[PDB]
Amino acid sequence: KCQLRFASLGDWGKDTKGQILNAKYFKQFIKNERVTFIVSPGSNFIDGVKGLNDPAWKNLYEDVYSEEKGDMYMPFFTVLGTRDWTGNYNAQLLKGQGDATNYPKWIMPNYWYHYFTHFTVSHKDLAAAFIFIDTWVLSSNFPYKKIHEKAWNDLKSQLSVAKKIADFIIVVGDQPIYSSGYSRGSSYLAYYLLPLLKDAEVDLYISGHDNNMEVIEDNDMAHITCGSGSMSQGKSGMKNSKSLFFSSDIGFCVHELSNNGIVTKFVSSKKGEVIYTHKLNIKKKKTLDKVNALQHFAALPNVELTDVPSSGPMG
Ligand SMILES: [Co+2]
Ligand SMILES: [Co+2]
């Protein structure tokens, strides 16, 4: 197949009628669109989890997103959002390390990490870099300063490599930089995160946190909010001037990478209808150095699980 297809589902972990209705359409589209993995922006569990054996794992994830015939057995690349950090965050990390299951495979090897992949098009190979960030760790409220700095430095290293070897670069996190939703974005991330993304010619920043769907396009970068996996908060005040689409509908996204670019379909759980299709052209990059890809892979930061003791820093 000459495409790479993935779905995005954010802020999904809450027992609501919306969650269950959304899950039905999610499964339908994943099968019919031939989605091969899922990414999860925003938070996972709206009320957090209490530990590894919290019934919430079964009740809000396993029993919601399972299907027979292995139709949902694929990677579920996730990150934490602010709602996860107020509970047993370490439990989600330990699950994220790790016989097939009926539900997707939970992947979160660290609070921030990357996944580089590739696909063939028509004799030619295109490479996609997925970079996963923890927007709370990157914030000024994170109390461990060394861990905070390491997360920023790893991000810079990941983007530096992606610039040299990736035709597509997609970043996934919790807090949006730009949003017409409740948070109204983050000037902090606009000042510190956005310049790194622009320097690396990132295609998409996919976030959640705000419980809506949106695409804001600025300087050939799409900011996608996909935070309505279980809940909806309404239209809010005045739309961002570069907003192309906004919906408070409970839903999800399906994304297609091809020789021509990225097509994102926003799906509403109201009746499983695609209510917006966003198309981003593939970039013509002068920074690529694919002949020496291995040497650039060798500059990526090690993906190690970080111990973040709940007691906070001492000394
Ligand atoms: Co700082
Ligand atoms: Co907030």
Q: What is the distance in A from the centroid of ligand 2 to the CA of 288?
A: 36
How far, in Å, is the centroid of ligand 1 from the Cα of 215? Answer: 28
CA 201 from chain centre, in angstroms, equals: 17
Q: CA 212 → CA 69, 194, 218, 308, distances in Å?
A: 32, 21, 19, 30
What's the CA-to-centroid distance between 145 and ligand 1, angstroms? Answer: 7
CA of 278 from ligand 1 middle (Å) equals 34
Judge whether 255 is annotated as a binding position.
Answer: no
Distance, CA 311 to ligand 1 centroid (Å)? 21
Cα(232) to ligand 2 centroid in Å equals: 14
Helices (H), 88-227: 89-97, 145-165, 187-192, 194-199
Ligand nearest to the CA of 209: 2
| Spatial distance between the Cα atoms of 207 and 179, rounded to a whole number of angstroms | 10
Chain centroid offset of residue 216 CA: 16
Known binding residue 123? Answer is: no
- The CATH number of whichever domain residue 32 belongs to comes to 3.60.21.10
Tell me how far apart the alpha carbons of residues 135 and 10 are, in angstroms, rounded to a whole number: 14
For residue 82, what is the enclosing H or E element? Answer: helix 82-85
Range of the domain at 144: 1-315
Number of domains in the chain: 1
Tokens representing residue 122 in the block: 């028509």
What method did the depositors use to determine the structure? X-ray
Contact call for residues 143 and 312 (beta carbons, < 8 A)? yes
Please state, in angstroms and rounded to a whole number, the distance separating the CA atoms of residues 63 and 67: 9
Q: Which ligand is nearest to the CA of 146?
A: 1
